[PDB]
């Protein structure tokens, strides 16, 4: 039994025609205090996977170490560690999902909501969610916390079902993600303006963007 | 305090015919008032012509299915590739569930297939392993909406022969796969209308001696 | 649940309902609450469905192992005590069971043991167990004699379940009858309350509280 | 909330953020927490939105009725009415109010009224959840008899920090200037104040 | 308090009420009459919270007797039962409700019919051929479902009642010290002394 | 814990430790059992190189396992006490769970099972 | 519930979905959440259904009497003041969450009221369980100087966001447009994007199917 | 100790072609104990029919209250109250007890005598009107009734067909609820004749 | 369970134990023997938590019988009581304690004296001329304080015991369905069939 | 507590008040919250006095054993050991620790470890109950590559304000300077810092 201390808010993501996009702000909240501002909550694993984590940051840092160790262990006695036997997004997810559900079953959970975004070896987009309860699900768009309530509706207007994915470009997808991040800054009381964004494309690979800012905001007051 | 359980909503439904059995379930997955996925399947082919669904808390549901699938694998290894009969699968699942009697899998489990005489079979479980073979069972969030409809339309309950003064009951007969799928679709559209956790899509797995077939239908997404 | 079993001149009658409930939700109307342990032993189920079902089939396995090891069918006393000693180990953990172990052996004759989840084990001639036990007792006690015929005893057991099925909201479905003799148990059919009630009302003239 | 009021040479300035909060959800990001109870007597509202509005409405009614009979009320009088309501209904209220007004005799005055309903006359006052983070800054930077431009910069910088650290604070920085000249409303958007 | 029963037969209503008054681990009395005559052809038995029972019974009794004097007329059992129900229906939303359950047995002289009404502390009224309050019902209802006939005589009703008391004496945990039996018919109310 | 396998097979297929235990039995005082039409009689030799014995308190050769079963033996006296104790405990345990005293066959089967266990357990003779 | 309000050029528009729930069950699939306080002042209400209807009728009644007393058309701020003081008096126990909007001699107005009695002003607002889905759309697509037709589109789009993404909201979209100088136009079921598909089967029973014990004519006349 | 599920019971109403149907079970119990199998839950005031589920003492009280109020209505108005008007009276009366409510689930059914239109409506325990074209449900087996009605119902049923649909809706819903059943009554209502039928159902 | 009594007279110990086994609102049995013979001249009655009682009684019985076989000798009542006390004294600080109260009536053959021991679930042992467990004591102790004499015969002890049962049947709330009476003396243990 | 650690040109300086509290009673007004775990790796202790001492003692033991085998540990290594203890025993600990050390390669480094057991490497860190009141001040005044005298003034002024507003903080201001030159202890009494 735990209670989360230093926390991270929404992680948002979606599929597009050639890959997946994922984003998360750089804030480490301490209750109502917006304590830490240089926190990276997107962690790449290899050149084909990005794990976005919300919830308790001490547990996030533990998960970082686990993923880091997983890369090391996979390389051992593995001549094809950078080829056919490289870590897939599906392997990384299932590992985390196993851990999350085992920890909930021991009544000592990792207080997190996690989204694993990546591209498989055959070019297929991978996007799946797992949380402190061990609950897993997949969808064209996935989001945690406030993102689930405010981002998903916006991202679902772009990709509402499976057939919309081939029709969605990386430009359109990134635009929707960046817009969603702005909306979260307007409305989530534990969000920051600064955020990171990652694109995993089956052609251009992993593009990791740091120090992005929410811009072009409106602040008008009605009369009465 | 940490609460290890959650409710992922959705509903499932199993019907057995003479030489077939269906196991249906909506594809919506939820927490509270949010939709997690519009298409997250929870009815699975487990091999040996057994289909299974464990509806309720998805994490427990997935764990159970995963363990039973594994049980089928080891049953082959240990007993010379022998086919696991539906009755044996049922009993095995009882022990899986009751094994966690004091920290239960929060799921209503239904399996479907064919018995050793080739006839359609549906078995249903409570969260701690009590099981029973039936012609008919709905499980999950909208079970209370669907089940009485099934009593009326599958088992012809409260239906008497016209003109017989309520003395002669409507006789029991097996339904064709076409008739059964009509009832499944109507059951799920009705459940979608009146239950908020039910909708998005319907996935039906049909089991005959030839194998396992799938059918998908859209449901209302509101 | 309503379950009963009583001893009489011609052996043992065992009668049970078939309803399962989750609160006010009627979960099933076709539950098998009698388990056939061997050709001479019966077990009744009341309380937790899984608890009863799981441990009473387990009991059957322990009885089978006894006759393999001892080359002799287990006594009703020893069979009931395996179950009672088992549940006593789990006392406090939250098991919910009200069971009756009924059967015949040469050394014992017809015998009924009441076993429940707080470890109580009682030999006796008459027991009614379940949420509708009191309703069954009312009818059974007021019509019971030792010298009942096999035909009358079967009816009284059936009629007692019907009485409880009617009044107790958490009892119903159908009646399952059993008769236990020196030659073993004999099944006397499933009797749906849907038809049995009106049949009994008309033929017996009882149930005048109900709109005919 | 983060709110403050600061006296200076020509009068007094009130300042506030614009965020209203139901848990971690921002129910209103363009809230006006600076409220008129009289021509040149205003207040900053913190605590319950419902409570503070109901109080401010009653006070405005009292001062309107006061004015009809006895002419313009003092800022002290206005603070007394706020106190009377906050003190006598302390069990049923969550309201941290700063009262600020301009007389010609008394110039700029600031009265703060915390949860208990006590009154405290100060040169400047800070209140609301976000005020905790700027006690150090405000104490070190406040001077008496500042100019209008200096006081505006003091409030802007102060609330900027309060907003930066308090998740319950944010949006724009609204201000109200109270002088002999009249009443001036000021607004400052994130793009400006964030990068101070 | 505890056991109160009622059986309506062809020509009469029979009320049986336990004699025991228990407080703690002591049976303080074994000859308590848990009934009041509301009018010459109307009898009310009662069970429930200590004090409340008698206080309520006598309050109703006073009101019906007041009515009888004012109008020089006897209220029908149906009218009395409705008055009692309304008093209990008021009571349940009071600061301190009457926790009293009652049976009302009466003979309607205008209809020449016996009538039995079961009313609980919530004000839940039902007319019945046979009635019980508390745990008694869990045994007697099923018993009466089997043995009761609508055309029975008063003597047959008493034998049917003996069968109930015997069952209760066998299976009830507490010693309720037997019952006082009273019959309500065309000739009024009388007590059976040897039961 | 002491683990050594003391009872093991030899090239010819004998377990010498079990066979040498039989030699200890051969050394022990003679014991005889004869059963009649309605009774069983247990006879036991007591060696007479021991005079000045106190026969009141000296352990008797025939031991009651329950009120209806008896056990006599030949071999090491100290070893027999361990078997008798275990047998007596099993006798009471049987009455407790089965609600019936042991059969002579069952009691024998138990005692024999204990003896067997000491022929393929580590660290014991 | 999802409810919204949006201001435009020459007036204001409000909208709402048409689902009412009890727990996870849909009680009414087409309820009216748009209320008339006065001819040109309308209210959208979320929360406790009986409370929103009752508080809207009471203030509406008092507003009519006030309009007759003063020989003036009622103002939105009067309804706002009366509603907020009533709700405050009851300390949140009257669970009415309202979006009040309308036109009057002073101009066009848009407010929201919470159950505890706090009021907000805005060009765009959203309340109810689907308010986050709606507000996400409003924050994305709202701009200054909206036309009538743009504001209706934005309002209904914001309601749709709730319908699809919030399990609390569903069925249809109601709209009411209050423009200055014109009559308020109430658009009941402005959109109906959740029509039930044709059922697979007719469940019309053969006459005589139901067993009957007694028949009798009921007298309704004097 | 949940007031709405101590006694048990159910009511359902449906509309047809120029007709309405309202039905209820007969059970009155005290939790597990069945007490009465004659407890009708449908009443009428003139041509307007009212069914009430929930706590039985409040069912009785409200019936007596609405008889009281409709009788005075008729004396002053010199005409019978209509279903639309009566629905409003029910709502007002329930909301009057906002913070100390009657624990009931009332259902209004009837045909407007002027317009001829079939009308049904439902309420929560505190007055919220739920109007419906098709059907209204209430009671301890409301989930079951919702499922039965949503699947079985079709518009514009003839009185004889509507009887079969509402009866089968109630019966099969009641048999999946422990606290409902023990008999049933169905009212078929046309413009100027009303037929009342008692249904044969399982008595467990 | 509920009522267990014990009286030590000149030459014997008499134990009386109620026959009723009640669970909920049902008397499941009315002929229950709440006692076990530990040895030929030692008897133990018991009352308390369901299951625990018999499980404990039979566990003690097995241990004493084991002792008897091992040593070919009968333990004194004092020795048996001390063994039982220690088992209960262990139990009370276990994860789940035995909630069982016992009386031990025995005849010491070496001393030629009857002995009665009262031991509660905590392991509180006392030797007494007369004993009771549960609510019974609240009536019987004062009664026996008045009527008991140390030199009474077995017949006088039975009449003294009849006086206790009569008082309990009059003033106790619950029907305990009479008692099974057993006598422990020089000739062992025997049951009185007509009580 | 009020504690902080600040990196600068020549290394790093740790700062702390001297108050230990049992409720409103000051159990020790001359507490030393700056603790040595290695020659030039120190920590600031906040939270439970018992917990933080027990942790610091274990860490000192670990680094002593580390040094015997692998030579001087890095400041990062020291922070990792603190984290390991704080994270794995999060349910049974109340310890907010700031770790600060001087390498010759890495110069001055600061790691803060809050309640959860997470690690955060920062230019400067503030912690303890009194830190809340100086977030505004410290953010506005901190610069990178300050001089020794500037950094001392920054810590002195910051903790002065933290002490002024936090009742749980007070006494003297202790500081520890970590540079290539060595280890220097500084103390500042109320009479000096109060009137800043
Ligand atoms: Cl506000
Ligand atoms: Cl210290
Ligand atoms: Mg739906
Ligand atoms: Mg029933
Ligand atoms: Mg902020
Ligand atoms: Mg039923």
Could you please describe the fold and organization of this structure?
- The PDB classes it as hydrolase/hydrolase inhibitor.
- The entry lists the keywords HYDROLASE-HYDROLASE INHIBITOR complex, Proteasome, Mutant, Inhibitor, Binding Analysis.
- Yeast 20S proteasome beta7-delta7_Cter mutant in complex with Ac-PAL-ep.
- Chain A: Proteasome subunit beta type-7.
- Organism of A: Saccharomyces cerevisiae (strain ATCC 204508 / S288c).
- EC number of A: 3.4.25.1.
- This is part of a larger assembly, with ten protein chains of eight kinds.
- Chain A is an alpha+beta fold and 224 residues long.
- Chain A has one domain (1-224): Glutamine Phosphoribosylpyrophosphate, subunit 1, domain 1 (4-Layer Sandwich).
- Helix content of chain A is 29%, strand content 31%.
- Chain A has four helices and 13 strands.
- In chain A, strands 1, 4, 5, 6, 7, 8, 9 and 10 form an eight-stranded antiparallel sheet that branches.
- Chain A is globular and about 70 Å long.
- Chain A starts with 5 loop residues before the first strand and ends in an 11-residue tail after the last strand.
- Chain B is 28% helix and 30% strand.
- Chain B is built from four helices and twelve strands; from the N terminus they run E-E-E-E-E-E-H-H-E-E-E-E-H-H-E-E.
- In chain B, helix 1 crosses helix 2 and helix 3 (143-153) packs antiparallel against helix 4 (177-194).
- The two termini of chain B are 33 Å apart.
- Chain C has one domain (1-212): Aminohydrolase, N-terminal nucleophile (Ntn) domain (Glutamine Phosphoribosylpyrophosphate, subunit 1, domain 1, 4-Layer Sandwich), CATH 3.60.20.
- In chain C, the strands form three sheets. Chain C has a five-stranded antiparallel sheet with strand order 10-1-2-11-12. A five-stranded antiparallel sheet of chain C has the order 5-6-7-8-9, covered by helices on one side. In chain C, strands 3-4 form a two-stranded antiparallel sheet.
- In chain C, helix 4 (150-167) packs across helix 5 (193-204).
- Chain C is globular and about 60 Å long.
- Chain G has 222 residues and is of the alpha+beta class.
- Chain G has a single domain, classed as Glutamine Phosphoribosylpyrophosphate, subunit 1, domain 1, CATH 3.60.20.
- Chain G is built from four helices and 13 strands.
- Chain G has helices at residues 49-70, 76-89, 131-141, 148-165, and strands at 3-8, 11-17, 20-22, 25-28, 34-38, 41-47, 96-104, 107-113, 119-121, 124-127, 173-179, 185-191, 212-218.
- In chain G, strands 10-1-2-11-12 form a five-stranded antiparallel sheet, with helices on one face. A five-stranded antiparallel sheet of chain G has the order 5-6-7-8-9, covered by helices on one side.
- The chains are: A alpha+beta (224), B alpha+beta (222), C alpha+beta (212), D alpha+beta (196), E alpha+beta (195), F alpha+beta (125), G alpha+beta (222), H alpha+beta (204).
- Strand 13 of chain G pairs antiparallel with strand 12 of chain H, so a sheet runs across the interface.
- Bound molecules: chloride ion (2 copies) and magnesium ion (4 copies).
- One magnesium ion binds at residues 163, 166-167, 169-170 of chain D.
């Amino acid at each position: 039994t735990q209670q989360p201390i230093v926390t991270g808010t929404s992680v948002i993501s979606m599929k597009y025609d050639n890959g997946v996009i994922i984003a998360a702000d750089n804030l480490g909240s301490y209750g109502s205090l917006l304590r830490f501002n240089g926190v990276e909550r997107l962690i790449p694993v290899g050149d084909n996977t990005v794990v976005g984590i919300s919830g308790d940051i001490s547990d996030m840092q533990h998960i970082e170490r686990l993923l880091k160790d997983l890369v090391t262990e996979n390389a051992y006695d593995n001549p094809l560690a950078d080829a056919e036997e490289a870590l897939e997004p599906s392997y990384i997810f299932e590992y985390l999902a196993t851990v999350m559900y085992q920890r909930r079953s021991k009544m000592n959970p990792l207080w997190n909501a996690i989204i694993v975004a990546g591209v498989q070896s055959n070019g297929d987009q991978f996007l799946r969610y797992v949380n402190l309860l061990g609950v897993t699900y997949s969808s064209p768009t996935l989001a945690t916390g406030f993102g689930a309530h405010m981002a998903n509706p916006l991202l679902r207007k772009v990709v509402d079902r499976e057939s919309d994915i081939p029709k969605t470009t990386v430009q359109v997808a990134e635009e929707a993600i960046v817009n969603a991040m702005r909306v979260l800054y307007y409305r989530d009381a534990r969000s920051s303006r600064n955020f990171s964004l990652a694109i995993i494309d089956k052609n251009t690979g992993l593009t990791f963007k740091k120090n992005l800012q929410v811009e072009n905001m409106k602040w008008d007051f009605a009369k009465d | 305090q940490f609460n290890p359980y959650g409710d992922n909503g959705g509903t499932i439904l199993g019907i057995a015919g003479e030489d077939f059995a269906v196991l249906a379930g909506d594809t919506r997955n939820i927490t509270d008032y949010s939709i997690n996925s519009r298409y997250e399947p929870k009815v699975f082919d487990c091999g040996d012509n057994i289909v299974m669904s464990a509806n309720g808390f998805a994490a427990d549901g997935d764990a159970l299915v995963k363990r039973f699938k594994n049980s089928v694998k080891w049953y082959h290894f240990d007993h010379n590739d022998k086919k696991l009969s539906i009755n044996s699968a049922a009993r095995n699942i009882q022990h899986l569930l009751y094994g966690k009697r004091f920290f239960p899998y929060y799921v209503h489990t239904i399996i479907a297939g064919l018995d050793e005489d080739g006839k359609g079979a549906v078995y249903s479980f409570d969260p701690v392993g009590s099981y029973e073979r039936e012609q008919c069972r709905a499980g999950g969030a909208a079970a209370s909406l669907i089940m009485p409809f099934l009593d009326n339309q599958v088992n012809f309950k409260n239906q008497y022969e016209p003109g017989t003064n309520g003395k002669v009951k409507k006789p029991l007969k097996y339904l064709s796969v076409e008739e059964v799928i009509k009832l499944v679709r109507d059951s799920f559209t009705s459940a979608t209308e009146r239950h908020i956790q039910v909708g998005d899509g319907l996935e039906i797995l049909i089991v005959t001696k030839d194998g396992v077939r799938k059918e998908f239908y859209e449901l209302k997404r509101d | 649940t309503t379950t009963l079993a009583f001893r009489f001149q011609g052996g043992i009658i065992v009668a049970v309902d078939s309803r399962a409930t989750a609160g006010n939700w009627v979960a099933s109307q076709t539950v098998k609450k009698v388990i056939e342990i061997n050709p001479f032993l019966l077990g009744t189920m009341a309380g937790g469905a899984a608890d009863c079902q799981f441990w009473e089939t387990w009991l059957g396995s322990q009885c089978r192992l006894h006759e393999l090891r001892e080359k002799e069918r287990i006594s009703v006393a020893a069979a009931s005590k395996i179950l009672s000693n088992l549940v006593y180990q789990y006392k406090g953990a939250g098991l919910s069971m009200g069971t009756m172990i009924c059967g015949y052996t040469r050394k014992e004759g017809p015998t009924i043991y009441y076993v429940d989840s707080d470890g109580t084990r009682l030999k006796g001639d008459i027991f009614c167990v379940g949420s509708g036990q009191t309703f069954a007792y009312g009818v059974l006690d007021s019509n019971y004699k030792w010298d009942l015929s096999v035909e009358d005893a079967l009816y009284l057991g059936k009629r007692s379940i019907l009485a409880a099925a009617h009044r107790d909201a958490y009892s119903g479905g159908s009646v399952n009858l059993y008769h236990v003799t020196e030659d073993g148990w004999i099944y006397h059919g499933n009797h749906d309350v849907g038809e049995l009630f009106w049949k009994v009302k008309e033929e017996e003239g009882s149930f005048n509280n109900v709109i005919g | 909330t983060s709110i403050m009021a600061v006296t200076f040479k020509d009068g007094v300035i009130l300042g506030a953020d614009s965020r209203t909060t139901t848990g971690a959800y921002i129910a209103n990001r363009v809230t006006d927490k600076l409220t008129r109870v009289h021509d040149k007597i205003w207040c900053c509202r913190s605590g319950s939105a419902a409570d503070t509005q109901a109080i401010a409405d009653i006070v405005q009614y009292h001062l309107e009725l006061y004015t009809s009979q006895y002419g313009t009320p003092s800022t002290e009088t206005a603070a007394s009415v706020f106190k009377e309501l906050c003190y006598e209904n302390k069990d049923n209220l969550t309201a941290g109010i700063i009262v600020a007004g301009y007389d010609d005799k008394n110039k700029g005055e600031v009265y703060t009224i915390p949860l208990g309903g006590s009154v405290h006359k100060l040169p400047y006052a800070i209140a609301g959840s976000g005020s905790t983070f700027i006690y150090g800054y405000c104490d070190k930077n406040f001077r008496e008899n500042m100019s209008k431009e200096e006081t505006v910069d003091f409030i802007k910088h102060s609330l900027s920090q309060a907003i930066k650290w308090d998740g319950s604070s944010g949006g724009v920085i609204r201000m109200v200037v109270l002088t002999a000249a009249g009443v001036e409303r000021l607004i400052f958007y994130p793009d400006e104040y964030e990068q101070l | 308090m505890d056991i109160i029963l009622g059986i309506r037969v062809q020509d009469s209503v029979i009320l049986a009420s336990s004699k025991a008054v228990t407080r703690g681990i002591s049976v303080l009395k074994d000859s308590d009459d848990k009934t009041r005559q509301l009018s010459p052809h109307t009898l009310m038995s009662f069970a429930g919270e200590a004090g409340d029972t008698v206080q309520f019974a006598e309050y109703i009794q006073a009101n019906i007797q007041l009515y009888s004097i004012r109008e020089d007329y006897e209220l029908s059992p149906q009218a009395v039962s409705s008055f009692v129900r309304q008093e209990l229906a008021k009571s349940i939303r009071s600061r301190r409700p009457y926790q009293v359950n009652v049976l009302i047995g009466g003979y309607d002289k205008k209809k020449n019919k016996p009538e039995l009404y079961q009313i609980d502390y919530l004000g839940t009224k039902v007319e019945l051929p046979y009635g019980a309050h508390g745990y008694s019902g869990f045994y007697t209802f099923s018993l009466l479902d089997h043995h009761y006939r609508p055309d029975m005589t008063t003597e047959e009703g008493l034998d049917l009642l003996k069968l109930c008391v015997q069952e209760l004496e066998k299976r009830m945990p507490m010693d309720f010290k037997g019952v006082i039996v009273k019959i309500v018919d065309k000739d009024g109310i009388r007590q059976v002394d040897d039961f | 814990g002491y683990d050594r396998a003391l009872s093991i097979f030899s090239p010819d297929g004998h377990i010498f430790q079990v066979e040498y235990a039989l030699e200890a039995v051969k050394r022990g005082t003679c014991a005889v059992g004869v059963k009649g039409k309605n009774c069983v009689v247990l006879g036991c030799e007591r060696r007479s190189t021991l005079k000045l014995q106190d026969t009141r308190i000296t352990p008797s050769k025939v031991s009651k396992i329950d009120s209806h079963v008896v056990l006599s033996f030949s071999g090491l006296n100290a070893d027999s006490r361990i078997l008798i104790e275990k047998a007596r405990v099993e006798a009471q345990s049987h009455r407790l769970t089965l609600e019936d005293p042991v059969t002579v066959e069952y009691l024998t089967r138990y005692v024999a099972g204990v003896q067997q266990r000491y022929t393929q357990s580590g660290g014991v003779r | 519930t999802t409810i919204v309000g949006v201001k435009f050029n020459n007036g204001v528009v409000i909208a709402a979905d048409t689902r009412s729930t009890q727990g996870p069950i849909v009680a009414d699939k087409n309820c009216a959440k748009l209320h008339r306080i006065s001819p040109k002042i309308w209210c959208a209400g979320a929360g406790t259904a009986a409370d929103t209807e009752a508080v809207t009728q009471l203030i509406g009644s008092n507003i009519e009497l006030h309009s007759l007393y003063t020989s003036r058309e009622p103002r939105v701020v009067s309804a706002l003041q009366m509603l907020k003081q009533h709700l405050f008096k009851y300390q949140g126990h009257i669970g009415a969450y309202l979006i009040v909007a309308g036109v009057d001699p002073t101009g066009s107005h848009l407010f929201s009221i919470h159950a505890h009695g706090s009021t907000d002003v805005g060009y765009y607002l959203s309340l109810g369980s689907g308010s986050l889905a709606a507000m996400a759309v409003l924050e994305s697509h709202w701009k200054q100087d909206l036309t009538k037709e743009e504001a209706i589109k934005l309002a209904s789009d914001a309601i749709q966001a709730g319908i699809w993404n919030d399990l609390g909201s569903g069925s249809n979209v109601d709209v009411c447009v209050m423009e200055i100088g014109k009559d308020a136009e109430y658009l009941r079921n402005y959109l109906t994007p959740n029509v039930r598909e044709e059922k697979q089967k007719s469940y019309k029973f053969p006459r005589g199917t139901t067993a009957v014990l007694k028949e009798s004519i009921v007298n309704i006349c004097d | 100790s949940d007031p709405s599920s101590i006694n048990g019971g159910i009511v359902v109403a449906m509309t047809g072609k120029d007709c309405v149907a309202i039905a209820c079970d007969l059970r009155l119990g005290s939790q597990s104990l069945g007490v009465s199998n004659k407890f009708e839950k449908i009443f009428h005031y003139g041509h307007v029919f009212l069914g009430i589920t929930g706590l039985a003492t409040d069912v009785t009280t409200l019936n007596e209250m609405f008889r009281y109020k409709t009788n005075l209505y008729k004396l002053k108005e010199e005409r019978a109250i209509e279903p639309e008007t009566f629905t409003q009276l029910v709502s007002s009366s329930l909301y009057e007890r906002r913070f100390g409510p009657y624990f009931v689930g009332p259902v209004v059914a009837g045909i407007n005598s002027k317009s001829g239109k079939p009308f049904i409506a439902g309420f929560d325990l505190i007055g919220c009107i739920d109007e419906a074209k098709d059907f209204i449900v209430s009671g301890t087996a409301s989930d079951q009734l919702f499922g039965m009605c949503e699947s079985l119902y079709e518009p514009n049923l003839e009185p004889e067909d509507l009887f079969e649909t509402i009866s089968q809706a109630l019966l099969n819903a009641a048999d999946r609820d422990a606290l409902s059943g023990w008999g049933a009554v169905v009212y078929i209502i046309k413009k100027d004749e009303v037929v009342k039928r008692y249904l044969k159902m399982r008595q467990d």
